[PDB]
Design an enzyme around this catalytic site. Structure first.
Site, PDB file in Angstrom:
ATOM      1  N   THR A 187      47.361  17.696  25.569  1.00  0.00           N
ATOM      2  CA  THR A 187      48.791  18.124  25.370  1.00  0.00           C
ATOM      3  C   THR A 187      48.170  19.476  24.521  1.00  0.00           C
ATOM      4  O   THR A 187      49.106  20.478  25.032  1.00  0.00           O
ATOM      5  CB  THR A 187      49.467  17.807  24.633  1.00  0.00           C
ATOM      6  OG1 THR A 187      49.238  16.248  24.398  1.00  0.00           O
ATOM      7  CG2 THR A 187      50.502  18.188  23.610  1.00  0.00           C
ATOM      8  N   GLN A 188      47.256  19.365  24.436  1.00  0.00           N
ATOM      9  CA  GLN A 188      46.887  21.139  23.631  1.00  0.00           C
ATOM     10  C   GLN A 188      45.435  22.274  24.531  1.00  0.00           C
ATOM     11  O   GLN A 188      45.654  23.407  24.560  1.00  0.00           O
ATOM     12  CB  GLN A 188      46.189  21.103  22.498  1.00  0.00           C
ATOM     13  CG  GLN A 188      45.069  20.572  22.636  1.00  0.00           C
ATOM     14  CD  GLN A 188      45.373  18.761  22.044  1.00  0.00           C
ATOM     15  OE1 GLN A 188      45.990  18.640  22.000  1.00  0.00           O
ATOM     16  NE2 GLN A 188      43.922  18.426  21.546  1.00  0.00           N
ATOM     17  N   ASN A 189      45.030  21.233  25.492  1.00  0.00           N
ATOM     18  CA  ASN A 189      43.866  21.656  26.538  1.00  0.00           C
ATOM     19  C   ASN A 189      44.138  20.730  27.501  1.00  0.00           C
ATOM     20  O   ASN A 189      44.607  19.346  27.791  1.00  0.00           O
ATOM     21  CB  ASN A 189      42.724  21.594  25.623  1.00  0.00           C
ATOM     22  CG  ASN A 189      42.541  20.108  24.666  1.00  0.00           C
ATOM     23  OD1 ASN A 189      43.165  19.308  25.318  1.00  0.00           O
ATOM     24  ND2 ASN A 189      40.816  20.082  24.345  1.00  0.00           N
ATOM     25  N   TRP A 206      44.774   8.824  24.537  1.00  0.00           N
ATOM     26  CA  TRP A 206      45.543   9.231  25.346  1.00  0.00           C
ATOM     27  C   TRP A 206      45.253   8.567  26.060  1.00  0.00           C
ATOM     28  O   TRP A 206      45.770   8.747  27.901  1.00  0.00           O
ATOM     29  CB  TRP A 206      45.797  10.468  25.715  1.00  0.00           C
ATOM     30  CG  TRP A 206      46.572  11.692  24.596  1.00  0.00           C
ATOM     31  CD1 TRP A 206      47.404  11.265  23.707  1.00  0.00           C
ATOM     32  CD2 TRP A 206      46.089  12.821  24.245  1.00  0.00           C
ATOM     33  NE1 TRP A 206      47.704  12.206  22.861  1.00  0.00           N
ATOM     34  CE2 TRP A 206      47.203  13.210  23.812  1.00  0.00           C
ATOM     35  CE3 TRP A 206      45.093  13.781  25.043  1.00  0.00           C
ATOM     36  CZ2 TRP A 206      46.966  13.904  22.888  1.00  0.00           C
ATOM     37  CZ3 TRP A 206      45.693  15.276  24.060  1.00  0.00           C
ATOM     38  CH2 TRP A 206      45.972  15.618  23.168  1.00  0.00           C
TER      39      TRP A 206
END
Lengths: 213, 244, 216, 196, 235, 233, 230, 240, 238
Positions: C1-3, C107
């Site tokens: 999500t962030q990376n 995840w």
């Protein structure tokens, strides 16, 4: 950023007669556009006289059945008495409400029979509001099965047909035709409904297939 | 372990509190500093420790402590504890201002300190604050007033009460001499050096071995004077002749 | 999500008369970059249960150290009582639902399988906690691509020998080599039977590019 | 969107609220009286968010009422005003901003009558006359034109009727009745309600 | 953080810390009250003997809010905490139900508080005893007397001070129906009851009356003097 | 001395076998479960006659269909009567039904032997609750009364006596009860209070009696009902 | 963990039994003199170790509190080191909030404040170190002494440790109000020279002055210098 | 007067009596010997079977911790079982934390300072259980350590704790220590256990063995089960 | 002065003794008698219930904890109920998380680590109750005495309570007909083991005897006042 719910689908029905409660089900859990499995029950045998139906997000349905199962056991040998049906409906109302601000996205129907023997069926929103009925399917084809057994069970908008009480033959033939109709018309069909049916002597569980597509 | 605790917060079989009346006997060992009010303002009159030269300068003494513009306090008993609590109660005074923008009418302050000092003798298992300190002050509500408290917790308006030793030289004689209606604070100084002139081993009662301090005013704001040196050499020759 | 997390693509499996076979490719794809080639995504646990991973691989190393530590810890109580693949599936389910319930979710999206005392087992555990049992599973785009070849043969006969199932998942893995973009050539195939868990290290796919020279 | 008004006299201060408890589209029961009774001589008023008026100012009524019936005498309205400014000002930024704006009519015995004023940010200021709400925007010049610093009581009441009849004429909300209380050196009185 | 269990059961069921608080209320002032059927009335031991007192801050007669008011007897500084917490929760019970708070409820709060200090870890249950008088929504001038064991009784004289076993047996003797009038026979019964113990009211006694949910009025030297005079004249 | 969590050279705890005492101290209460109700009575031992006797609460209704009857160290029960009624309306809240008597008695008796010196936050208890009581209640099983101890031990009871008259009144009650109510168990129980008599011939000022009957919810008896019964003896 | 009950308590006479024992443990400590002088102070002390075996440049007894305030003790060894740790921390709280070096009077307020709660508060015994304070603070120097009770007094001269009655009487004899620089050091040296148990070695004494430029220890070449000028 | 009964109070000659009272509290419990050799460490525990009612392995006294180190314990089985399971949690935090499988010296120093730092307070009692460890990594050597209730941990070769350790240390000293290949010493362990068991009275000496070795590759097994009918054939060496 | 080992779950008697958590073992010797045992298939529990009152349910001993792991308390009762709310709650927690039956050995071991903490620390009495837990896991139906000294025993056929040693010495010399001996003839063989702790004059009546059955293909089942009446035989005259 994450969307912690999906809609795994499924439609579950329960009918309260006079000594029974036909808790219907479906099977196909599926999100997006691909199906996962065709085995999965949605009616869970809580006690010998209480059967839940449980539709919506499947993981939270599953954890919810673990919680209400384990707390039914936590009741049963804290008072040396099994649960009733309305008490199951009450404590499941406060379990659904107790996590309100990140809610249990699940439409669940509790069938079963009362203390005196007459069948009852409790319906729920995903935050917890119980009413006893004699019908109200819920969860994916909620707005599809409801007007049929508003008519063929409740006899509303209907003149003098000299309506008889239901039984395990008229209501038995009233569950299979509505799920082949919703098998035609809903997308979240089910391929084999597993009707957990409850009676005075005990419990049995009929299964018959559907439109498999 | 329960073998080791002093068990301070226990009633006696006679009903009293053992660690509290041991603080009352701690006052009688070291303690002076009477206080007289008038129609005019109020004064403390105090004694230092001994004759021991070896003492350079006190800004205020170890006895009279300033608390607001309109209050002050004097201290008996154990001097190590009370210093702490007077800074403690000083905090209380200022935060009343922060809560109310008032100069804290002094009975609120005495009530607060007596509540926390009662809380140390109520629970916690600690020793109580061994000091029977007293207070002078003014508010717009009441007149000039002094209060007096003790390590037990109760307090009162104690118009001429002294603390410490000789309760009779200081104070039973005062309850045969104080005129309750009018007092005329110069004559309150005269009565203060009368009582301190009787409660001492020496006639050398100048500000080497006395600490007298007054509270007065001019045009509304209060003035706390510590009565600097030569005023004491004035009042010590005000007998010239006799006092009793 | 962030990376750009380091992912896999697919752990597809099928049960058979005998045991259950699961297969996955060794790939550490860093967002359209095959950054890690020789990277095993098939965890062995106690001798009657297996475990895969499709999503984030770092969370799979977290799960291999908590599954590993848990199964050796309850393994050294003596008194028999190893984990049936009931309990790895259910514990992993409650771990992930209790992990997204605090919005700090794992995840990866795995399938665990294993041969119990009586019969085999092949259970799916999702990123969100969507857990179930199935005769044949696939994760990621395999759930779009390997899943039709699996639930075609198993609708005809729900009984497989070991060579038919092994050829079946080799052929499905070849299909995911053909169509899935985040897929690599070599892959581990891995089978648990009555004799236990065993992992065949790196296999290959016999590619069929014979339709290429008919393009104009 | 309600309306609070006050006028400081030489030996009094009179306040008047609008006697309308509103809703989304309709109005509820008129009375609901906004003026909260303090100890004997203080009287504060509160509008703003529907749910912090009945909550915050009643809590201030609890603490000041506790001060009077704990330590004899009551508060001067200066200490009550700075008290509720402290409590709103430190309940402002922390977790739940009490969105109320207060008037505080009051008088001490040995000083004049005072009418304190504060916004929803709890910034306090004395005022010879203050107002609130949207109705403050049009009625405040009539208290600019006619208010002498020394005014008799009945002149201030009929001035207040000028302000309310203007507020009746131009301001778009139906505010038909207004609750009026004059407080002065005999305690809190209550003038007859002004209706239309 | 002090956690020694102080208030513990000794043998023969005797909870010694509480009976030590019973001598601690046996060694106080001499408080007294009369439920006088339209009025209630208190009285305790004047002060000692003011001389250099301040009469404003020698108050054994305390006011809770407006109608209920109490006269403690014992240790005179652990009482003021119970006064403060009584006033605080009394304002909270004005917050919730908004009544002229009933005297039963606040004396249940006091008795429940002192019983909560006969239970907690190391905090010496109080040496006070109350006279919770007052009214309610409909007259009913109920009196209550608490205890360091947290037991409240709704009795009608309850002289519970230091030399007050003689006063409560006197009040057992001399309170049947002669004090049903407005104030004079009741207050005469109180000042007679405390003039049994000490001495004239010009230095010793002080009283307080309460009439029908208004006007908690104390009696300046004047009141006490008058009472004493009347008593002497009658006797 | 020694602490509270220590075992005694007899075999028991110190504070528990000391909490069996201060039950001999205090008033006496009795209860009889019948086949159509359960009656409770207590001679609440008024000290002086200068006073008001109808505010010594020793028959306390937990719910509409559970009434308790405490004795011993009075007013130490109010925290666990508070826990009894708060737990009662928590049960009715979360489960939408009535209760048993072993669920309130199960819930209160967990708080009895739950104390200690050095434990969690100082809202815990130091001494055990020195109050023995018994919950007269009607259920869908049957009317029944559950005699508690300060030890947390609670037992099924149909005829149980507490207080100072725990030997003579219990032995008298042992031989006079077998059958059913039929209105006379409440008149053959104050007769046991009539043998017990300490200060006064058991008029309608010094005994409090209350029955719990399956038709009604409970009935705390008023004065003219009591002296209607006392006139019949 | 912890006790949370005070072991310092009141005698039946009405006095603190632990604090007079603390002044006994101070009075059995090493002797130390301190002389307030017209521009600056001198705080001498006596470092007699067991043998001639130790590093006399290792541990100090004169040691500053961060700006211009040194403090010397007499009594318990490491309880002093705790009071130096707390005192430096309190002076740095004051310095980071008010941006000046701390007035000596306020440092004695806060050090006497921290020594008070060890006469209370849960099983701790009081320190038993009556250290004395110096400091230049603006205009005129200061000198104090925080007893293990928590009291403090300012003066012109004192002694402490062993036979301190002779130090107080002897400094009462030889003191002048203008007696200002190195003459104070002189009489400090001949106050420790009074007993010393023998021979007056420069490695066994150390002094510290506050000569309007910060407190500073004296190098061992300077004390022996005036030991040559006796 | 009464310098006993609290671990935070010394003797007047520096001897914390709550530790040496815990030391005799393992001297009134049965033996458990551990013998090091070049291929691993062999444990053997005496059992004092009270009644016939207890079955085989009624109380485990050869616990294991980290799939290779062992737990021959002596004293109170509650306390020994407690520090056994927190040793399990300690090697759990090492393997989870540092990845590498726990070397035994660090585990013995860790559990050693745990049970030592637990003897500095009057708010706890000392443990009443001596116990010993033992394993080998592929390059460690057959490390074993033994830990007292004082908290001191030493590396040994043939340490023996229990009641009859006064007898048991002599035969382990006369046994050839260094160079034999552990299978014989499993057999030879029974000779030590049958010598040191000097009763027939209702204790039945129903012993129990476990080891780590090259036949195990860093593990633990109750024996497998065959030397229990092979080392049982070392009777008559204690009967003659 | 007299016994300075009375401030005492921190202290050691100078021989080896911890001096009161063996005295908690005395405090379960004082409790009422009971007996459990095991077969090759299903383990049983049998308890006599003391009636120290008018009459009662006689302070019902054997308890439902579980979903086949049943217990039998002896000693204190409130402390027993606290310990079985612990055991009960985490047995249901293992139903929740792992979704298997919690095995009996890990159950009794972690309560053996839960009642072991107050034996360790200061001013906290041990759980003075002797459980006699019994359940049917994957292998044979185990039965565990545990104790207030936190030292459980993987036993078979154990009796604890008042004068239960005589029941042991009946039950020790009749172990040969275990690992056979089905339910109808097994519980008779346990009741005639219980019928020695009685004071030599008394029937095992239907009132005071409450038993429990657990094992293969049956839930842990409590037989109360009525259901113990089909178990009837013996004389023993004992």
């Amino acid at each position: 950023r994450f969307s912690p719910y999906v809609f795994n689908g499924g439609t579950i029905l329960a009918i309260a007669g006079e000594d029974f409660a036909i808790v219907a089900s479906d099977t196909r859990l599926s999100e997006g556009f691909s199906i996962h499995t065709r085995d999965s029950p949605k009616c869970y045998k809580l006690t010998d006289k209480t059967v839940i139906g449980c539709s919506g997000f499947h993981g939270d349905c599953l954890t919810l059945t673990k919680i209400i199962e384990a707390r039914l056991k936590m009741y049963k040998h804290s008072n040396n008495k099994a649960m009733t049906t309305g008490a199951i409906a009450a404590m499941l109302s406060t379990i659904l409400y107790s996590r309100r601000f990140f809610p249990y996205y699940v439409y669940n129907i509790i069938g079963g029979l009362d203390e005196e023997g007459k069948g009852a069926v409790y319906s729920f929103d995903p935050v917890g509001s119980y009413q006893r009925d004699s019908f109200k399917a819920g969860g994916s084809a909620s707005a599809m099965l409801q007007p049929l057994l508003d008519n063929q069970v409740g006899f509303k908008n209907m003149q003098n047909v000299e309506h008889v009480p239901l039984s395990l033959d008229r209501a038995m033939r009233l569950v299979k035709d509505v799920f082949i109709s919703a098998a035609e018309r809903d997308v979240y069909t089910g391929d084999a409904l597993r009707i957990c049916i409850v009676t005075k002597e005990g419990i049995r569980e009929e299964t018959v297939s559907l439109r498999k597509d | 372990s329960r073998r080791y605790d002093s068990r301070t917060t226990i009633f006696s079989p006679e009903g009293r509190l053992y660690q509290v009346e041991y603080a009352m006997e701690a006052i009688g060992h070291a303690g002076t500093c009477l206080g007289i009010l008038a129609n005019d303002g109020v004064l403390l009159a105090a004694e230092r420790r001994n004759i021991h030269k070896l003492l350079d300068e006190v800004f205020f003494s170890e006895k009279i402590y300033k608390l607001n513009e309109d209050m002050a306090c004097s201290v008996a008993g154990i001097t190590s504890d009370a210093n702490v609590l007077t800074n403690e109660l000083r905090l209380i005074a200022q935060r009343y201002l922060l809560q109310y923008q008032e100069p804290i009418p002094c009975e609120q302050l005495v009530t607060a300190l007596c509540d926390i000092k009662q809380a140390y003798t109520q629970f916690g298992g600690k020793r109580p604050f061994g000091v029977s300190l007293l207070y002078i002050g003014w508010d717009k509500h009441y007149g000039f007033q002094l209060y007096q408290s003790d390590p037990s917790g109760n307090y009162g308006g104690w118009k001429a009460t002294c603390i410490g030793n000789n309760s009779a030289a200081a104070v039973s004689m005062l309850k045969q001499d104080y005129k309750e209606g009018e007092m005329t604070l110069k004559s309150a100084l005269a009565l203060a050096i009368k009582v301190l002139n009787k409660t001492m081993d020496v006639s050398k009662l100048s500000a080497e071995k006395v600490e007298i301090a007054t509270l007065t005013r001019e045009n509304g704001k209060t003035v706390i004077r510590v009565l600097k040196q030569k005023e004491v050499e004035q009042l010590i020759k005000k007998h010239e002749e006799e006092e009793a | 999500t962030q990376n750009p997390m380091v992912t896999g693509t697919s752990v597809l499996g099928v049960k058979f008369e005998g045991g259950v076979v699961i297969a996955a490719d060794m790939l550490g794809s860093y967002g359209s970059l095959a950054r890690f080639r020789n990277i095993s995504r098939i965890m062995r646990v106690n001798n009657s249960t297996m475990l895969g991973a499709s999503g984030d691989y770092a969370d799979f190393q977290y799960l291999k150290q908590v599954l590993g530590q848990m199964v050796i810890d309850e393994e050294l109580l003596g008194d028999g009582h190893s984990y049936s693949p009931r309990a790895i599936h259910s514990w992993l389910t409650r771990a992930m639902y209790s992990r997204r319930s605090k919005m700090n979710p794992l995840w990866n999206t795995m399938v665990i399988g294993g041969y119990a005392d009586g019969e085999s087992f092949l259970g799916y555990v999702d990123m969100l906690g969507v857990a179930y049992e199935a005769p044949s599973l696939a994760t990621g785009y395999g759930a779009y691509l390997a899943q039709p070849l699996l639930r075609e043969v198993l609708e005809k006969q729900p009984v497989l020998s070991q060579t038919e199932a092994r050829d079946l998942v080799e052929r499905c893995m070849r299909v995911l080599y053909y169509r899935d973009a985040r897929s690599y050539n070599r892959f581990q195939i891995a089978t648990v039977t009555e004799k236990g868990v065993e992992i065949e290290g790196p296999l290959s796919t016999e590619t069929n590019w014979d339709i290429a020279h008919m393009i104009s | 969107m309600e309306y609070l008004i006050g006028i400081q006299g030489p030996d009094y201060v009179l306040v008047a609220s609008d006697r309308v408890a509103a809703s989304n589209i309709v109005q509820m029961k008129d009375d609901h009286d906004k003026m909260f009774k303090m100890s004997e001589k203080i009287l504060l008023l509160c509008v703003g968010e529907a749910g912090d008026t009945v909550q915050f100012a009643e809590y201030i009524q609890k603490n000041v009422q506790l001060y009077k019936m704990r330590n004899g005498y009551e508060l001067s309205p200066t200490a009550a005003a700075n008290f509720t400014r402290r409590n709103l000002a430190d309940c402002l930024r922390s977790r739940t901003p009490y969105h109320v704006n207060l008037l505080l009519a009051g008088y001490d015995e040995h000083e004049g009558p005072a009418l304190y004023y504060m916004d929803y940010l709890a910034a306090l200021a004395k005022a010879p006359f203050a107002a609130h709400g949207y109705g403050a925007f049009l009625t405040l010049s009539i208290l600019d034109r006619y208010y002498t610093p020394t005014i008799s009581r009945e002149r201030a009441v009929e001035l207040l009727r000028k302000c309310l009849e203007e507020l009746q004429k131009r301001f778009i909300l139906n505010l038909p009745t207004f609750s009026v209380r004059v407080i002065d050196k005999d305690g809190i009185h209550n003038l007859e309600n002004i209706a239309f | 953080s002090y956690d020694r269990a102080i208030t513990v059961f000794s043998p023969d069921g005797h909870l010694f810390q509480v009976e030590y608080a019973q001598e601690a209320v046996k060694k106080g002032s001499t408080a007294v009250g009369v439920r006088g059927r339209d009025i209630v009335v208190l009285g305790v031991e004047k002060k000692s003997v003011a001389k250099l007192q301040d009469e404003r801050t020698v108050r054994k007669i305390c006011a809770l809010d407006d109608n209920v008011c109490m006269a403690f007897a014992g240790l005179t500084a652990d009482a003021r905490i119970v006064i403060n917490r009584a006033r605080v929760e009394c304002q909270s019970h004005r917050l919730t139900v908004e009544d002229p708070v009933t005297v039963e409820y606040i004396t249940r709060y006091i008795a429940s508080l002192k019983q909560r200090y006969t239970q907690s870890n190391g905090r010496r249950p109080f040496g006070i005893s109350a006279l919770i008088v007052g009214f309610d929504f409909d007259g009913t001038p109920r009196l209550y007397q608490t205890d360091p064991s947290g037991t409240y009784h709704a009795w009608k004289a309850n002289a519970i001070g230091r030399g007050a076993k003689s006063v409560r047996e006197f009040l057992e003797k001399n309170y049947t129906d002669d004090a049903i009038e407005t104030d004079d026979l009741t207050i005469k019964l109180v000042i007679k009851a405390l003039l049994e113990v000490v001495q004239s009211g010009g230095k010793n006694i002080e009283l307080a009356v309460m009439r029908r949910d208004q006007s908690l009025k104390i009696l300046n030297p004047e009141e006490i003097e008058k009472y004493v005079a009347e008593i002497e004249k009658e006797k | 001395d020694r602490g509270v969590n220590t075992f005694s050279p007899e075999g028991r705890l110190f504070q528990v076998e000391y909490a069996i005492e201060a039950i001999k101290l205090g008033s006496t209460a009795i209860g009889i479960q019948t086949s159509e109700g359960v009656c409770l009575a207590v001679e609440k031992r008024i000290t002086s006659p200068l006073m008001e006797p109808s505010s010594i609460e020793k028959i306390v209704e937990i719910d509409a269909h559970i009434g308790c009857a405490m004795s011993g160290l009075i007013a130490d029960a109010k925290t666990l009567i508070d826990k009894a009624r708060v737990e009662t309306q928590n049960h009715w809240f979360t489960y939408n039904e009535t209760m048993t008597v072993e669920s309130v008695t199960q819930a209160v008796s967990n708080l009895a032997l739950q104390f200690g010196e050095e434990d969690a936050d100082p809202g815990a208890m130091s001494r055990p609750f020195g109050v023995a009581l018994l919950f007269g209640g009607v259920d869908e099983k049957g009317p029944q009364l559950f005699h508690m101890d300060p030890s947390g031990t609670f037992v099924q009871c149909d005829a149980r006596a507490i207080g100072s008259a725990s030997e003579g009144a219990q032995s008298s009650l042992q031989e006079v009860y077998h059958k059913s109510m039929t209105l006379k168990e409440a008149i053959k129980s104050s007769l046991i209070i009539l043998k017990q008599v300490m200060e006064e011939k058991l008029n309608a000022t010094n005994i409090e009696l209350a029955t719990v009957q399956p038709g009604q919810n409970f009935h705390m008896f008023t004065k003219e009902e009591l002296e209607e019964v006392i006139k019949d003896i | 963990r912890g006790y949370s009950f005070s072991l310092t308590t009141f005698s039946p006479s009405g006095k603190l039994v632990q604090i007079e024992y603390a002044l006994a443990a101070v009075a059995g400590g090493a002797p130390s003199v301190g002389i307030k002088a017209a521009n600056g102070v001198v705080l001498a002390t006596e470092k007699k170790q067991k043998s001639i075996l130790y590093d006399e440049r290792s541990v100090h007894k004169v040691e500053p509190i961060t700006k211009h305030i040194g403090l010397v003790y007499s009594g318990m060894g490491p309880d002093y080191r705790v009071l130096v740790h707390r005192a430096r921390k309190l002076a740095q709280q004051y310095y980071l909030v008010y941006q000046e070096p701390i007035p000596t009077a306020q440092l004695v307020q806060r050090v006497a404040s921290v020594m008070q709660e060890y006469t209370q508060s849960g099983g701790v015994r009081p320190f038993g170190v009556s250290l004395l304070i110096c400091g230049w603070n603006e205009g005129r120097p200061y000198l104090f002494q925080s007893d293990p009770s928590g009291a403090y007094f300012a003066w012109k001269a004192t002694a402490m440790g062993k036979n301190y009655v002779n130090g107080k009487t002897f400094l009462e004899k030889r003191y002048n109000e203008d007696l200002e620089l190195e003459d104070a050091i002189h009489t400090a040296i001949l106050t420790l020279k009074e007993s010393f148990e023998g021979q007056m070695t420069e490695d066994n004494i150390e002094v510290g002055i506050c000569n309007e430029a910060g407190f500073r220890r004296l190098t061992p070449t300077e004390v022996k210098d005036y030991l040559a000028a006796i | 007067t009464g310098y006993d009964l609290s671990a935070s109070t010394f003797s007047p000659d520096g001897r914390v009596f709550q530790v040496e009272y815990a030391m005799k509290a393992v001297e009134n419990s049965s033996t458990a010997i551990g013998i090091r050799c070049k291929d691993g460490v062999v444990f053997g525990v005496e059992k004092l079977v009270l009644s016939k009612l207890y079955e085989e392995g009624s109380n485990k006294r050869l616990f294991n911790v980290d799939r290779h180190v062992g737990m021959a314990v002596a004293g109170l089985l509650a306390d020994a079982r407690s520090l056994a399971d927190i040793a399990r949690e300690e090697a759990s935090n090492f393997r989870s934390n540092f990845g590498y499988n726990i070397p035994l010296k660090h585990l013995a120093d860790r559990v050693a300072m745990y049970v030592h730092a637990y003897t500095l307070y009057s708010a706890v009692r000392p443990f009443g259980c001596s116990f010993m460890l033992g394993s080998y990594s592929v390059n460690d050597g057959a490390q074993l350590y033994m830990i007292d209730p004082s908290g001191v941990s030493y590396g040994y070769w043939g340490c023996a704790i229990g009641k009859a350790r006064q007898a048991a240390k002599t035969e382990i000293e006369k046994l050839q220590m260094k160079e034999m290949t552990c299978r014989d010493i499993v057999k030879e362990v029974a000779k030590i256990i049958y010598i040191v068991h000097d009763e027939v009275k209702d204790k039945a000496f129903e012993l129990e063995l476990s080891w780590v070795g090259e036949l195990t590759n860093g593990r633990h097994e109750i024996v497998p089960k065959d030397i229990r009918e092979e080392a049982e054939k070392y009777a008559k060496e204690s009967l003659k | 002065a007299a016994n300075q080992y009375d401030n005492d779950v921190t202290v050691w008697s100078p021989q080896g003794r911890i001096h009161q958590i063996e005295y908690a073992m005395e405090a379960v010797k004082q409790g009422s008698a009971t007996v459990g045992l095991k077969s090759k298939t299903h383990a049983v529990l049998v308890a006599l219930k003391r009636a120290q009152s008018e009459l009662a349910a006689h302070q019902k001993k054997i308890l439902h904890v579980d979903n086949h792991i049943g217990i039998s308390i002896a000693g204190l009762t409130a402390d027993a109920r606290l310990l079985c709310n612990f055991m009960r709650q985490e047995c249901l927690d293992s139903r929740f998380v792992f979704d298997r039956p919690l095995p009996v050995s890990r159950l009794v071991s972690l309560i053996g680590s839960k009642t072991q903490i107050p034996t360790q620390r200061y001013g906290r009495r041990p759980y003075g109750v002797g459980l006699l837990i019994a359940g049917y896991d994957d292998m044979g139906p185990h039965i565990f005495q545990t104790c207030p000294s936190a030292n459980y025993f993987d036993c078979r056929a154990m009796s604890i309570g008042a004068r239960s040693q005589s029941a042991r010495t009946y039950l020790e010399r009749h172990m040969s007909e275990f690992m056979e001996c089905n339910l109808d003839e097994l519980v008779k063989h346990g009741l005639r083991a219980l019928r020695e702790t009685l004071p030599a004059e008394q029937d095992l009546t239907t009132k005071n005897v409450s038993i429990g059955i657990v094992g293969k293909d049956l839930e842990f089942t409590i037989y109360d006042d009525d259901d113990v009446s089909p178990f009837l035989d013996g004389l023993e005259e004992r």
